[PDB]
Design a protein around this ligand. Structure first.
Ligand SMILES: Nc1ncnc2c1ncn2[C@@H]1O[C@H](COP(=O)(O)OP(=O)(O)OP(=O)(O)O)[C@@H](O)[C@H]1O
Ligand SMILES: Nc1ncnc2c1ncn2[C@@H]1O[C@H](COP(=O)(O)OP(=O)(O)OP(=O)(O)O)[C@@H](O)[C@H]1O
Lengths: 200, 203, 619, 623
């Protein structure tokens, strides 16, 4: 409904003071030191104001105590008039960290299970393997729809060749080929070369 | 099959001159002959003036160490007033007698330091050069007598051949008085410098 | 003098709200699901004190149903509901909310938090619709129907037929030009973008009927540690970053005070391919308040040099805008940066106590570290501590600078180094003879960005640094050496000038150096100026240019070879021999080529070498 | 049975919403009132257009601003039409009831005025910075009236206060306690310097004694017909619009009428800025005006990136803009303007193409931007090709366009040639051109990296292809006599090729003999596809990216030997005499090393070469 507590904050320094005559590295330290000494002088001021009334505590003494009481009232007034820093708005509640230190049969499994499941299905480059590509080529050689399946075969086979060239796992090396394809003559030449290879 | 250019990081301006004093020594870095003019001096004094004017507005209006070797010039023809230097009894000609008497670097010391650096940058000679003597200890000793009955200021007696900056000479005479009370604020200095720069810029 | 009350015309405000309050179209869905959500936790809170409140239904589900043949949209939810009193004034009043009244009457402590403080949310649905109908059933009131069409008159009635248990059914008629909002892809995209972190399931129906879920992942950062385990962190990382590799570093952050928030930060394993390619607007860190998406595309959120860390930050209260895309008084957004960067930097220390994992971390993120140690003008000192570099007297590994300083010889106040193009070049270069003859250490520099960092790193724990490719190196000798070479200058005095007339310009001062034991001559560069690598790197930048910074040149000569004494004897013989001329120019050419500096015209050198080899051949 | 009611609205929360959570800054409050005076001024003028008798109540039509720091007050005094009791109790006292729209609609069929503002919820922005508002009004009929408010929930209306006034309206603002920063002299001109400069009424400002600065002098010219303009007025308007001291170079006036009416002025600069590619601040060189008010600047989807020097302004009316007055909803409309702006910019360039030394200066200034535009866009290659100029070898100092080179071809060859190097002296005397020079053909030069960047994407020109002189496959049309000469040369030099392959190899794919060298023994050539030496040098140094697999498949070389020189004959005769000696090894390594040095690549280590030549000179001197 109303927002008025967020109208006066001070930044140590961010970007908004760049008069091309002063050096930033010096201005930053000057501002920080000025803020800290202002904090310290106000700090000693509150101690003096406190000690005044504290040592104050007959009618004259009561009047003095009332005057310092109004002085403390003024001190809270100026404190409420003081802007927000970067060192009074938050405290810590808890923290923690973790290093995250790590501690033929596989070929046969990845052949039979993956080939069967992906033949039933037909993320791919994320999961499919060389045997899946071999069975896709097997499906194409059974076929010879034609152009599109050939196109996908060349696309993901080119992905595998790119992975081999980079000597990295293609499981996380598929976005680069697309972001580069979004060379065309070479792609068409390889397309027709593979087409005449498979047809022959 | 194109690297698709982009990502220009620019460059920082190459650091070079480091004291604003070593420039006044060697012709290899900057020739001392016909290259000497007046537009350079009015320009550099103008940048110092506007920098000081901006600095003195905020809460850090007190500098405390107005010193030419603190001032730096880069290779974009720009001037910076930095800290550089980072109890100090370090006596020099550049401090005001208000420090040498009791204490408390304040406004008056800044005005006095501005005056002496302006002197050194216009005349192009040694620090507080006087034709009467050339030894440092007696310089300090005479400064110890600056609170006496006669002032002892940098040599700008007479002869002009230039007229023009007669106003600026009025300022530099103003900066050289024993009484710290009358010393002017930055406003007249920056106004006169801006007007002279404009007169030299509309051409 | 008279006093009069305030007035406000209603008709024009109606068009004011629905035409110039928002900028896009994908927000009415978020508004409707937020309304259903607050109804849900309202009845949920009502339940803990009265079980019988849930007799008209035990399930809490929100569902959306499209229909193309009528071109209609339906939202069904079971919540608190309305009575006749609620329908007349709570909904029929502009800029008034029952949520605030409910929470004010509930002034007995804070246990639940709900959204909605303005009271213009509902009418946003009128942006793309003509007819809106609400069917309402309350736990103690009869079925009621409400209809409106944005004309100035709204209709209420008691409806009959098709009984419901309890709750709200909202039916929206559509336009003719907004058919695109009736397909699966658009609704899935919108729902996953805007309101994908709500603590209740959301389903969708497509017509053999179908049953599917649009979001089935739970918020994680609302539970305290000492209960969460590593596997949950891994699963959350996998779900958020749609990848297959796991994470590398995790950190949890919590604060308090007037400005309170919570944070999760993650550091990955492999570097992204398009990291500094930019172009794509930055989309690393997200900001939320009460689990609704507010702001993204970090602009001042985090510095540019840390644009590789994913994470999430949640707040509790903030001065939002009438339309919930911006944040008023952006200065507050700055403050969190000071509380983020620092804390994140802390992590980089803890990873340094184990050996090989730090090598794995450095190998991919060295460039980010170098850009950081360059640009961060305030925390430079902390960043400079954790660098790792090659060195001469080690093996194939890398050491730390503190370890380097831990072995100063005795009277050594400076640290030397050298920049180049590859390891084998600086390994056997012409500058590294005497510094290994006396016995000392060198630090090798090999990357193009690296040469920027040394430009700003001038000091390190009370010791300065000098470059082995600058004029005026000073290293310790002893009195016999000093007398020996100062009497050496007293011999080549005439020699000291003769090169001056032969090579005229492009040489400033020639002296006899003490850095050569196996090479006659070398070229040295001035103090104020650049090095050769600086010149070639500047020539590499293609989008820039001025000039006028090129540093001066100096030439050195060694007093040990027989070649130089032969030159001295031939020169003192006469000054009119061309043999000294050609051998001096050839020596200068080969020396200038030997020190990285680019050539000027290769034809001269090629012709000279061709003539030499041909004359040696016998013809 | 059924009922039909009407909507109702709450007042307090509506007011709180309209004050505290609608705007993104606090400088707007001056702009709102400054705008909201001019409309009333226009109503005065239009109503006076028909009735001369309204000339007896005042002849001055201005607006004055008076600050006061003893009493902490601000006064805005205007001489507007004002309101009577009915309007004051009716228009100002209610939310969202604008008299401007009613006045516009009531009178029509050939009027000409566009009053600013239609929402009717703007005046209350005066409560952004202040605590009490008071308005004094005397329109033309009854005594003056005063209206006092403090955004509490009840306003006060008062009769004449006894201050004698002729006409107009005064708005008096009681400033808050901390906002005194809006009182000193600087921020006043700072704020009025940005928003409300182009308004059709004079503005003054009073400060003190021993009138002052009028913050407006320049009447905009784009509203006029671009048919009697002259150079001097256009120039001084240019000087006023931007901070500089030089005259303009060329300008363009643009206007589209139809479904969308919009006009524009565009200038090309004179001296290029020194930060034309510096980071931050984005593309910003253009301002957006609607109904003579600035909205926003620096939005990327307005002009293509390769144009960051054109400076001007585009203005229109009848645009849908939101409440905050900082953007434009339904971003689709913004996309249409660029397709016309870029066409007019290209038209201006094409018209400039007729001048000699103006084009010389323009090219010297923005060659890089023109070539970047060539590379980036994929639609205007056909037009941006004609604006390129180059060096050559037949003219020397003076420049040339590709059209002239096409116009003076030799009648037999079907190709175009080029060469990219470091500087002019590198390739003006290199070994790659001798036979072409002997025949008498023309080879164009290239000496900047941006030319390297733009040369890859270019494919042909007027149906002719671009081929390199630094690639395998270069032939010139000659007679078959030379062909059988190379035939028996191949039949006569095969074993030498085998030896040159088997020497140390691992660096050369094949050794061949061709006709491009007449005064050099050896040279290096590249392959039909892949990077050149200059490519590797430029891309090995700049930027941060590091992955050389691409270069690993764009790097391979071949060696060429000229079988005419005496040195080749000598080494060949020693070769067929015997091939197991060491002198042959020394000569071949020296020749390969100097060939690599002269080619343009970088030696892996110069120390070995230096040691070899040093040993040679040591033996020569007989030590
Ligand atoms: N589906 C719903 N179930 C229950 N109450 C509802 C529903 N839709 C609206 N309401 C009621 O409507 C009122 C809120 O209307 P409106 O959406 O305009 O305000 P809001 O809650 O502030 O908006 P928002 O949360 O979208 O910012 C409340 O009284 C709320 O109970
Ligand atoms: N000083 C004035 N003299 C005459 N008419 C005025 C004056 N101030 C306001 N009005 C009129 O009172 C009505 C209130 O206008 P208000 O400021 O609320 O909105 P607006 O005119 O639509 O917007 P804006 O302030 O952006 O122009 C309008 O009809 C306006 O012309």
């Amino acid at each position: 409904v109303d927002y008025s507590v967020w109208d006066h904050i001070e930044v140590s320094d961010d970007e908004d003071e760049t008069h091309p005559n002063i050096d930033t590295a010096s201005l930053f330290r000057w501002r920080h030191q000025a803020r800290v000494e202002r904090m310290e002088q106000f700090q000693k001021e509150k101690e003096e104001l406190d000690r005044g009334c504290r040592e104050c505590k007959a009618q004259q003494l009561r009047k003095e105590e009332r005057s310092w009481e109004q002085k403390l009232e003024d001190m809270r007034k100026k404190e409420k008039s003081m802007p927000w820093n970067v060192d009074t708005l938050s405290k810590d509640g808890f923290s923690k960290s973790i290093v995250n230190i790590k501690p033929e049969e596989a070929r046969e499994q990845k052949h039979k299970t993956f080939v069967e499941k992906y033949e039933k299905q037909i993320d791919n480059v994320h999961l499919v393997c060389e045997e899946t590509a071999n069975y896709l080529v097997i499906w194409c050689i059974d076929l010879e729809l034609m152009e599109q399946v050939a196109h996908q075969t060349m696309v993901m086979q080119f992905i595998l060749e790119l992975a081999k060239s980079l000597k990295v796992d293609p499981r996380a090396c598929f976005r680069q080929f697309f972001t580069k394809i979004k060379y065309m003559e070479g792609f068409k030449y390889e397309l027709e070369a593979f087409k005449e290879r498979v047809r022959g | 099959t194109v690297k698709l250019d982009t990502m220009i990081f620019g460059v920082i301006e190459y650091c070079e001159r480091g004291s604003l004093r070593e420039v006044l020594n060697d012709t290899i870095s900057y020739p001392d002959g016909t290259f000497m003019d007046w537009e350079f001096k009015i320009s550099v004094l103008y940048d110092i003036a506007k920098g000081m004017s901006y600095l003195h507005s905020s809460k850090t209006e007190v500098h405390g160490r107005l010193k030419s070797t603190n001032c730096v010039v880069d290779s974009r023809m720009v001037v910076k007033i930095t800290d550089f230097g980072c109890l100090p009894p370090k006596k020099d000609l550049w401090t005001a007698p208000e420090h040498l008497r009791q204490a408390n670097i304040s406004q008056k010391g800044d005005v006095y330091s501005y005056g002496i650096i302006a002197q050194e940058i216009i005349l192009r000679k040694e620090t507080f050069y006087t034709l009467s003597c050339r030894d440092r200890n007696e310089k300090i000793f005479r400064v110890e007598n600056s609170n006496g009955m006669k002032p002892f200021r940098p040599d700008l007696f007479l002869e002009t051949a230039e007229e023009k900056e007669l106003e600026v000479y009025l300022l530099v005479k103003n900066c050289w008085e024993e009484d710290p009370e009358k010393r002017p604020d930055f406003k007249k200095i920056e106004t006169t410098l801006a007007k002279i720069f404009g007169l030299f810029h509309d051409q | 003098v008279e006093t009069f009350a305030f007035q406000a015309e209603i008709a024009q405000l109606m068009s004011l709200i629905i035409n110039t309050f928002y900028s896009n179209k994908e927000i009415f869905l978020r508004e409707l699901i937020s309304n259903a959500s607050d109804a849900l936790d309202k009845i949920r809170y009502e339940s803990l004190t009265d079980p019988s409140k849930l007799d008209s239904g035990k399930e809490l589900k929100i569902d959306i149903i499209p229909n193309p043949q009528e071109r209609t949209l339906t939202l069904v939810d079971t919540g608190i509901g309305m009575t006749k009193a609620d329908l007349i004034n709570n909904l029929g009043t502009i800029a008034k909310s029952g949520t605030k009244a409910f929470m004010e009457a509930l002034q007995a402590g804070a246990d639940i938090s709900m959204i909605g403080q303005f009271g213009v949310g509902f009418y946003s649905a009128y942006l793309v619709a003509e007819k809106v109908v609400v069917i309402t059933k309350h736990n103690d009131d009869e079925q009621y129907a409400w209809e409106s069409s944005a004309g100035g008159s709204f209709t209420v009635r008691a409806d009959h037929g098709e009984p419901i248990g309890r709750g709200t059914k909202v039916i929206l008629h559509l336009k003719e030009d907004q058919t695109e909002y009736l397909e699966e892809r658009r609704v899935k995209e919108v729902v996953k973008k805007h309101s994908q972190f709500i603590g209740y399931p959301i389903t969708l129906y497509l017509e053999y009927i179908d049953q599917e879920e649009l979001n089935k992942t739970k918020p994680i950062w609302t539970r305290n540690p000492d209960d969460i385990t590593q596997e949950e962190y891994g699963e959350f990382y996998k779900s958020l970053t749609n990848d297959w590799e796991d994470h590398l570093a995790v950190k949890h952050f919590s604060v308090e005070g007037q400005l309170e928030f919570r944070a999760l930060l993650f550091i990955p394993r492999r570097a992204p391919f398009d990291l500094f390619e930019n172009k794509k607007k930055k989309n690393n860190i997200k900001l939320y308040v009460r689990r609704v998406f507010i702001m993204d595309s970090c602009d001042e959120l985090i510095p540019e040099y840390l644009n590789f860390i994913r994470g999430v930050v949640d707040s509790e209260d903030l001065p939002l805008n009438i339309s919930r895309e911006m944040l008023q008084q952006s200065k507050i957004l700055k403050v969190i940066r000071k509380n983020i960067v620092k804390k994140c930097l802390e992590l980089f220390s803890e990873l340094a106590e184990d050996k090989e994992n730090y090598k794995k971390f450095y190998e991919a993120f060295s460039k980010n570290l170098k850009l950081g140690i360059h640009e961060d003008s305030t925390n430079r000192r902390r960043l400079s501590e954790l660098l790792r570099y090659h060195t001469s007297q080690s093996g194939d590994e890398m050491t730390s600078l503190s370890e380097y300083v831990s072995r100063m010889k005795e009277t050594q106040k400076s640290i030397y180094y050298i920049t180049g193009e590859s390891k084998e070049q600086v390994a056997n270069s012409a500058f590294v003879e005497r510094v290994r003859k006396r016995g000392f250490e060198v630090v090798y520099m090999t990357e193009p960005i690296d040469e920027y960092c040394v430009q700003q790193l001038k000091e390190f724990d009370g010791k300065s640094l000098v470059s082995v490719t600058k004029e005026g190196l000073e290293l310790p000798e002893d009195e016999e050496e000093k007398k020996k070479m100062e009497e050496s200058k007293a011999k080549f005095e005439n020699l000291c000038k003769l090169m001056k007339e032969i090579l005229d310009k492009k040489v400033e001062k020639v002296t006899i150096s003490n850095r050569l034991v196996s090479s006659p001559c070398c070229i040295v560069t001035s103090t104020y100026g650049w090095t050769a690598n600086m010149e070639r790197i500047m020539k590499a930048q293609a989008l820039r240019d001025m000039g006028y910074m090129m540093a001066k040149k100096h030439l050195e000569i060694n007093p040990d070879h027989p070649i130089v004494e032969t030159l001295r004897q031939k020169a003192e013989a006469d000054k009119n021999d061309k043999a000294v001329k050609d051998l001096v120019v050839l020596l200068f050419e080969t020396a200038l080529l030997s020190s990285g500096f680019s050539l000027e015209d290769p034809q001269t050198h090629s012709n000279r070498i061709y003539r030499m080899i041909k004359l040696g051949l016998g013809i």
